[PDB]
Amino acid sequence: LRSLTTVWAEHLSDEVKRRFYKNWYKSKKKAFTKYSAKYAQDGAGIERELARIKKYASVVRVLVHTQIRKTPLAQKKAHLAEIQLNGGSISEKVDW
Amino acid sequence: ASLPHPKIVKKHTKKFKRHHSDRYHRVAENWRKQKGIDSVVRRRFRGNISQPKIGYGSNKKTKFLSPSGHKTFLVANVKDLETLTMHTKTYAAEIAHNISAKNRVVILARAKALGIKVTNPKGRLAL
Amino acid sequence: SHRKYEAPRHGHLGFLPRKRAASIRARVKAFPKDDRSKPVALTSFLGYK
Amino acid sequence: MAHFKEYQVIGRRLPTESVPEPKLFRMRIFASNEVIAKSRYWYFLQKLHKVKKASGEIVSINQINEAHPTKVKNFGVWVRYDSRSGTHNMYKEIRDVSRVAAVETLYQDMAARHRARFRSIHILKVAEIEKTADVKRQYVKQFLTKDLKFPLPHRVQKSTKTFSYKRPSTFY
Amino acid sequence: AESHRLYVKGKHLSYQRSKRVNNPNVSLIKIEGVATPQDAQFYLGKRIAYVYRASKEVRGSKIRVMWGKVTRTHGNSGVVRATFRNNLPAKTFGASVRIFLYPSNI
Amino acid sequence: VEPVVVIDGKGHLVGRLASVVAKQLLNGQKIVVVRAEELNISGEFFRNKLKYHDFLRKATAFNKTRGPFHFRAPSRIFYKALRGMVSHKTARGKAALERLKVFEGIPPPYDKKKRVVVPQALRVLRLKPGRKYTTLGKLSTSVGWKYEDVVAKLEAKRKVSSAEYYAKKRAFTKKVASANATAAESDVAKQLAALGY
RNA sequence: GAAAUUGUUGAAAGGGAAGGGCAUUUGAUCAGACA
RNA sequence: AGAACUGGCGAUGCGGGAUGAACCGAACGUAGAGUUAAGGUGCCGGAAUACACGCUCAUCAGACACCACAAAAGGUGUUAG
RNA sequence: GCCCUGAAAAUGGAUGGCGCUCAAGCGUGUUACCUAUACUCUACCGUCAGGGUUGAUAUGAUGCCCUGACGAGUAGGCAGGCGUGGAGGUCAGUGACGAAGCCUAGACCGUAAGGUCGGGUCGAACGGCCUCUAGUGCAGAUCUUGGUGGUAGUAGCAAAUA
RNA sequence: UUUGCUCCACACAAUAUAGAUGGAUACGAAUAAGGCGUCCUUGUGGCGUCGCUGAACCAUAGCAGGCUAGCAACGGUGCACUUGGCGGAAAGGCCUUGGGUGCUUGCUGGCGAAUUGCAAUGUCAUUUUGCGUGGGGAUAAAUCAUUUGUAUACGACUUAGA
Ligand SMILES: [Mg+2]
Ligand SMILES: [Mg+2]
Ligand SMILES: [Mg+2]
Ligand SMILES: [Mg+2]
Ligand SMILES: [Mg+2]
Ligand SMILES: [Mg+2]
Ligand SMILES: [Mg+2]
Ligand SMILES: [Mg+2]
Ligand SMILES: [Mg+2]
Ligand SMILES: [Mg+2]
Ligand SMILES: [Mg+2]
Ligand SMILES: [Mg+2]
Ligand SMILES: [Mg+2]
Ligand SMILES: [Mg+2]
Ligand SMILES: [Mg+2]
Ligand SMILES: [Mg+2]
Ligand SMILES: [Mg+2]
Ligand SMILES: [Mg+2]
Ligand SMILES: [Mg+2]
Ligand SMILES: [Mg+2]
Ligand SMILES: [Mg+2]
Ligand SMILES: [Mg+2]
Ligand SMILES: [Mg+2]
Ligand SMILES: [Mg+2]
Ligand SMILES: [Mg+2]
Ligand SMILES: [Mg+2]
Ligand SMILES: [Mg+2]
Ligand SMILES: [Mg+2]
Ligand SMILES: [Mg+2]
Ligand SMILES: [Mg+2]
Ligand SMILES: [Mg+2]
Ligand SMILES: [Mg+2]
Ligand SMILES: [Mg+2]
Ligand SMILES: [Mg+2]
Ligand SMILES: [Mg+2]
Ligand SMILES: [Mg+2]
Ligand SMILES: [Mg+2]
Ligand SMILES: [Mg+2]
Ligand SMILES: [Mg+2]
Ligand SMILES: [Mg+2]
Ligand SMILES: [Mg+2]
Ligand SMILES: [Mg+2]
Ligand SMILES: [Mg+2]
Ligand SMILES: [Mg+2]
Ligand SMILES: [Mg+2]
Ligand SMILES: [Mg+2]
Ligand SMILES: [Mg+2]
Ligand SMILES: [Mg+2]
Ligand SMILES: [Mg+2]
Ligand SMILES: [Mg+2]
Ligand SMILES: [Mg+2]
Ligand SMILES: [Mg+2]
Ligand SMILES: [Mg+2]
């Protein structure tokens, strides 16, 4: 099994955003800021990616993360992780 | 400039170093024969160093010649140098190592007059 | 020469190496077999003990 | 033991005062050179007569050529052979074009079927089976049936270079 | 045109050897398209260049050549033996090598 | 001969395919081997299954890591056969091996390149008809290999595209022949006949 | 003011020792003969 | 473990028998060219995936002297008598 | 005859390995081909042998010249040589304008023991040749004395209340 | 940290090479059977034909291929552009549109080549890198220390800090 593309949401919580870092405070927090631009242009690129997942792809997983701030814990940095998605049909999956 | 001679053929130019002279500092490189009983070298097992033996000895003809065709003759002074006067095509003078700088220039100078070759004419050369 | 008495070995060799894990988040090595006749939903979830 | 020739060999016991002109005996011998032939001759003679080579002489050695070397023939063959636990008489039939070819395959067949090497065999008779229906071993009658024909299925042609760009075919 | 080759392609196979001892003075060449000792009797004598490259320029070029010649045929399938001016380096087993058409006999 | 020789595994006898591939490397010839799952071994499936388990039990008693490694994939059963025919612990040996590549299936580049065969290792030329033999793909899938089905799938898909390629090509050479004909019996053509063309 | 043994500098090699033999590539280095 | 005759090893490398004191070939000055021995020529590995006729299919086949083992007894496997 | 049953042992494993099945297996035949320090021919070394040659006015008569055969080697014998302290003779030998010693993947002679040079360092003595003489040549002896390592910045420096 | 990075273009320098020297030239399947062409009732169909090796096919003439003219064709091909489409197994490549432009040995002309001295690879490939210039583009983070304890012998792990 080999990963083909990942498509990402446009806005990303600081909670996830800060999992992509080790020295969050000091940083310019530029994570995903060029990506976020890809939506602007009508949508073009994110489509063809979704679109290409649809065409190939034997399985689909979702990228989800915890709202660790809704939790009494100290660590502000959330947990992100792939969950396979089982409901019917490749295309129906990626739409979801 | 020496008597013509047949192509000088050296037969085994590689030095015969002592066995294990490469293995412990205590063992000098100078040839020395294995006498031990089990020894691979003394036994000539394919793979080990050769030992000197009479087959290697040089052509009676070209033996003792250095590349230029001249047997070399060690020289201390002019008198010595002059023993080579009727033999310039056969011997070359090597100036002895302990001959002084100003004495070398006399010798060198006379060898020139006599047409006698000198193998080490730049020793002590006050340049 | 031969044990003398017999006992089971100690502990299970299908859990080696008894090494520290590469991450605090243990990995889902396997997902449920997929039946594409059902509606779409996750097959796992995250939380804190 | 090789590629054979067949030899008439003639020998006799050495002459003597009281017995000049001794009897004279002949063997047809199948060997590859005349030197083996003569030796073979003395081998069997001493299996038969009071003689050794030491006290007897070769009188004549002549190669016999096949009479009709391009006529097919059904040979009957008789042999004595030694096994690992016994000795044995035997009859095979060979179909070829000369006695000399026949004896070559016999020796082969014996080595192949019975592991008998040359030292261990004694050809007794080799003779032409004049009229069929006295041919007896089936693996030969097989080839006497009228208007005979057969295919050679699964043709393997031998490639002359390591790679090929087709994919072969065994048609034929 | 596009082909300028005046030699036959060839291959540095092994040194002459036993099972367990090689002799660097004789190399064994496989000559492209020669399959039998008879076939190879043709190249006996032809000269061989092993052409290689270096970093120090010299007599003008950065290309040097080891020269040799074919000397006998070797075995049953057109392999050939050859000697060189200096024995070939043995990193060369499997390297290409050029066989010429001179000295000519046609 | 060519800079690269692509061999179609299918229908070949492992150890004969290995034996010739080894030599070619050693002589400087680059080789890639394809469809290694359609490789053959003499002996019925069970025999080579038993042989494989034999191999399967050799391992370093103190540490099964250091011990003999058992690759289950068809390309790699193959490579093993090969490697043993090459002095792989010498630099010259490593060199020859790097000229090799083995593949289950026929992946890009090579699927549009041509592949050849090796008649002296072609089962249907070698095995006495009657003898039983084994297909690598089936052998491997019974000792652990995981990807027979997915290769089969990709192949059947590849096999469709190439059937078109072909059909097109056959269509075009039909024309080509029809040209090379609307031009037979011409002067130049008769001339070339004379010279063997 | 040797050697064992050490520091620095320069150069080189190193997939479970190193060292050695025949041979050649490559790098460095150098004798001789020519006139 | 102890004798007989010879030949060897010990005191001896070289080629072969993967390996090995004694087997096979052959005994050694330094080297060029040729030819061979014993033993080999699918690939490792120099050398025919050579020719030819049979035989053998083994759910622990077999594969070369010394040599690194197998026996009585059995088979309606198959071959030739 | 081949094959199969008869046929049970301890780390995982050996027709040398891969692998081979109208063989790359078993029996037998026929060619070709690979390659030993062996055989043939040639050069060169050395050993032994047989000849030739005192004739000066030039140089080795233990010489020079022709020729033929042979060459393994422990213990062991003998021979020709290499090297060191010191002694007689000699070269009217080298040397403070640098002896001796020491360093040097620089040069050259010898099959070798070794010999010679260059360059650096050094500071007072030293060598070639014919002879004489011995406290005369080291890798070992759990060798003698002295010096030096890896081990290793390691074991450790924790009893007696602070 | 004294003007740094990246893609494109040529430029200079180095550096190297397991080994260019016309072209890796694409069904599948079967082998006691097939490929191709053709017809048809489209089928396990009729008829024809081929194999017996790639000994092929394609390319191939021109200063290592110079400078030039014309004709017959309207064909081939190289290059950069542009149209539509395909390929996710490692797609990273394939096909198609249209104008441009070079070459054409399809045929027919003009000019050139010597002295590289009778051979000497006689140098025409492609790898990695370094440094200037200037045509696009981009504007971070990790670590130490501090800190948490879901972690810990030390490192490591896991939190937190404009
Ligand atoms: Mg992508
Ligand atoms: Mg000693
Ligand atoms: Mg011992
Ligand atoms: Mg002994
Ligand atoms: Mg028990
Ligand atoms: Mg880790
Ligand atoms: Mg007759
Ligand atoms: Mg001092
Ligand atoms: Mg060397
Ligand atoms: Mg003894
Ligand atoms: Mg012996
Ligand atoms: Mg040996
Ligand atoms: Mg053995
Ligand atoms: Mg091997
Ligand atoms: Mg070979
Ligand atoms: Mg042959
Ligand atoms: Mg026996
Ligand atoms: Mg029995
Ligand atoms: Mg039976
Ligand atoms: Mg066995
Ligand atoms: Mg074998
Ligand atoms: Mg046989
Ligand atoms: Mg010799
Ligand atoms: Mg001789
Ligand atoms: Mg002797
Ligand atoms: Mg003395
Ligand atoms: Mg003395
Ligand atoms: Mg004294
Ligand atoms: Mg000198
Ligand atoms: Mg000085
Ligand atoms: Mg001094
Ligand atoms: Mg003083
Ligand atoms: Mg004396
Ligand atoms: Mg003493
Ligand atoms: Mg000693
Ligand atoms: Mg000592
Ligand atoms: Mg000692
Ligand atoms: Mg001693
Ligand atoms: Mg001591
Ligand atoms: Mg001490
Ligand atoms: Mg300290
Ligand atoms: Mg401590
Ligand atoms: Mg305490
Ligand atoms: Mg303590
Ligand atoms: Mg390389
Ligand atoms: Mg047909
Ligand atoms: Mg059709
Ligand atoms: Mg039909
Ligand atoms: Mg074709
Ligand atoms: Mg042109
Ligand atoms: Mg690839
Ligand atoms: Mg013209
Ligand atoms: Mg810039």
Curated annotation (Swiss-Prot), chain B:
One annotated GO molecular function:
structural constituent of ribosome
Single GO BP term: cytoplasmic translation
Principal place of residence? cytoplasm
UniProt cross-references to CDD domains, sorted A to Z: Ribosomal_L32_L32e
- Supply the InterPro entries for this chain: Ribosomal_eL32, Ribosomal_eL32_CS, Ribosomal_eL32_sf
Cellular component terms (Gene Ontology): cytoplasm; cytosol; cytosolic large ribosomal subunit
Q: List-wise, which residues carry Phosphoserine?
A: 39
Which keywords appear in this protein's UniProt record, sorted alphabetically?
Answer: Cytoplasm, Phosphoprotein, Ribonucleoprotein, Ribosomal protein
**What does the UniProt entry say about where the protein is found?**
Cytoplasm
Any Pfam family from its record, for instance, is: Ribosomal_L32e
Q: Which SMART domains match?
A: Ribosomal_L32e
Question: Quaternary form?
Answer: Component of the large ribosomal subunit (LSU). Mature yeast ribosomes consist of a small (40S) and a large (60S) subunit. The 40S small subunit contains 1 molecule of ribosomal RNA (18S rRNA) and 33 different proteins (encoded by 57 genes). The large 60S subunit contains 3 rRNA molecules (25S, 5.8S and 5S rRNA) and 46 different proteins (encoded by 81 genes).
Q: Which family does it belong to?
A: Belongs to the eukaryotic ribosomal protein eL32 family.
PANTHER family recorded: 60S RIBOSOMAL PROTEIN L32 AND DNA-DIRECTED RNA POLYMERASE II, SUBUNIT N (PTHR23413), RIBOSOMAL PROTEIN L32 (PTHR23413:SF1)
Q: What is this protein called?
A: Large ribosomal subunit protein eL32
The organism is: Saccharomyces cerevisiae (strain ATCC 204508 / S288c) (Baker's yeast)
Curated annotation (Swiss-Prot), chain C:
Modified positions (Phosphoserine) in chain numbering: 23
Q: What happens when the gene is disrupted?
A: A mutant confers resistance to trichodermin, a trichotecene toxin produced by plant-pathogenic fungi.
* Location relative to the cell: Cytoplasm
Any stretches that span the bilayer, and where are they?
none
Q: Where is this cross-link: Glycyl lysine isopeptide (Lys-Gly) (interchain with G-Cter in ubiquitin)?
A: 38
Q: How does it assemble?
A: Component of the large ribosomal subunit (LSU). Mature yeast ribosomes consist of a small (40S) and a large (60S) subunit. The 40S small subunit contains 1 molecule of ribosomal RNA (18S rRNA) and 33 different proteins (encoded by 57 genes). The large 60S subunit contains 3 rRNA molecules (25S, 5.8S and 5S rRNA) and 46 different proteins (encoded by 81 genes). uL3 forms together with ES39L one of the contact sites for the signal recognition particle that targets ribosomes to the endoplasmic reticulum membrane.
Q: Identify its protein family.
A: Belongs to the universal ribosomal protein uL3 family.
Look up the further comments and give them: Present with 450 molecules/cell in log phase SD medium.
* Name recorded for this polypeptide: Large ribosomal subunit protein uL3
Q: Which organism is it from?
A: Saccharomyces cerevisiae (strain ATCC 204508 / S288c)
Swiss-Prot record, chain E:
**One Pfam family cited in the UniProt record for this chain:** Ribosomal_L35Ae
Query: Where can this protein be found?
Result: Cytoplasm
What keywords does the record list, in alphabetical order?
Acetylation, Cytoplasm, Isopeptide bond, Ribonucleoprotein, Ribosomal protein, Ubl conjugation
N-acetylalanine: residues carrying this PTM: 1
Q: Name one GO biological process term.
A: ribosomal large subunit biogenesis
Q: Where is this cross-link: Glycyl lysine isopeptide (Lys-Gly) (interchain with G-Cter in ubiquitin)?
A: 46
What InterPro entries has UniProt attached to this entry?
Ribosomal_eL33, Ribosomal_eL33_CS, Ribosomal_eL33_sf, Transl_B-barrel_sf
Q: Name one GO cellular component term.
A: cytosolic large ribosomal subunit
Coiled-coil ranges (or none) = none
Q: How is it modified after translation?
A: N-terminally acetylated by acetyltransferase NatA.
GO MF annotation terms: structural constituent of ribosome
Under PROSITE patterns, the record lists: RIBOSOMAL_L35AE
Please give the function described in this protein's UniProt entry. Component of the ribosome, a large ribonucleoprotein complex responsible for the synthesis of proteins in the cell. The small ribosomal subunit (SSU) binds messenger RNAs (mRNAs) and translates the encoded message by selecting cognate aminoacyl-transfer RNA (tRNA) molecules. The large subunit (LSU) contains the ribosomal catalytic site termed the peptidyl transferase center (PTC), which catalyzes the formation of peptide bonds, thereby polymerizing the amino acids delivered by tRNAs into a polypeptide chain.
Entry's family note? Belongs to the eukaryotic ribosomal protein eL33 family.
What else the UniProt entry mentions is: There are 2 genes for eL33 in yeast.
- Protein name per the record: Large ribosomal subunit protein eL33A
Q: Which organism is it from?
A: Saccharomyces cerevisiae (strain ATCC 204508 / S288c)
From Swiss-Prot, chain F:
Main subcellular location: cytoplasm
The source's superkingdom equals: Eukaryota
Q: What are the recorded Gene Ontology BP terms?
A: cytoplasmic translation; maturation of LSU-rRNA; negative regulation of translation
Post-translational modifications reported in the UniProt record: N-terminally acetylated by acetyltransferase NatA.
Q: Where in the cell is it found?
A: Cytoplasm
Glycyl lysine isopeptide (Lys-Gly) (interchain with G-Cter in ubiquitin) crosslink location in chain? 175
For this protein, the record's InterPro entries field holds:
Ribosomal_uL13, Ribosomal_uL13_CS, Ribosomal_uL13_euk/arc, Ribosomal_uL13_sf
Arranged from A to Z, the UniProt key words for this protein are: Acetylation, Cytoplasm, Isopeptide bond, Ribonucleoprotein, Ribosomal protein, Ubl conjugation
Q: Please verify whether the record's keywords include Lipid metabolism.
A: no
What Pfam families does the database record attribute to this sequence? Answer: Ribosomal_L13
User: One GO MF term, please?
Assistant: mRNA binding
Subunit structure as annotated in this protein's UniProt entry: Component of the large ribosomal subunit (LSU). Mature yeast ribosomes consist of a small (40S) and a large (60S) subunit. The 40S small subunit contains 1 molecule of ribosomal RNA (18S rRNA) and 33 different proteins (encoded by 57 genes). The large 60S subunit contains 3 rRNA molecules (25S, 5.8S and 5S rRNA) and 46 different proteins (encoded by 81 genes).
The entry's family comment says: Belongs to the universal ribosomal protein uL13 family.
HAMAP family, from UniProt? Ribosomal_uL13
The name under which this protein is listed is: Large ribosomal subunit protein uL13A
* Organism listed in the record: Saccharomyces cerevisiae (strain ATCC 204508 / S288c)
> Which gene holds the coding sequence for this protein?
RPL16A
